[PDB]
Amino acid sequence: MVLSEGEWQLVLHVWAKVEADVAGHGQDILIRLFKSHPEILEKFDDLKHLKTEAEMKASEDLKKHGVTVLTALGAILKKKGHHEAELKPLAQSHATKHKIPIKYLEFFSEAIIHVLHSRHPGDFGADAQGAMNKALELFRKDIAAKYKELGY
Ligand code: HEM
- Method underlying the structure: X-ray
Count CB neighbours of 29 within 10 A.
23
Assigned fold of 1-152: Globin-like (1.10.490)
Ligand 1 atom nearest to 37, measured from its CA? 1
Q: Which of 54, 29, 22 lies closest to 136 in space, CA to CA?
A: 29
Nearest CA owner, ligand 1 atom 22: 94
Q: What three-state secondary structure class fits 43? A: coil
Say yes or no: CB of residue 34 within 6 Å of ligand 1.
no
Calculate ∠ Cα 32-34-35, nearest 5°.
65
What's the resolution in A? Answer: 1.3
| In contact, 33 and 70? CB cutoff 8 Å | no
Q: For the chain, give every domain's residue range.
A: 1-152
Q: Is the CB of 104 under 6 A from ligand 1?
A: yes
Closest CA to 73 of 86, 92, 60: 86
| Torsion, Cα of 44, 46, 52, 56 (10° steps) | -90
DSSP 8-class letter at 151: T
Within 8 A by CB and 6+ apart from 28, the residues are 115, 119
Q: In angstroms, what is the C-alpha Rg of the chain? A: 15
Could you give the CA distance from residue 45 to residue 86 in angstroms, rounded to a whole number? 25
DSSP string, 55-86: HHHH-HHHHHHHHHHHHHHHHHHTTTT--HHH
Number of helices followed by number of strands (H, E) in the chain: 8, 0
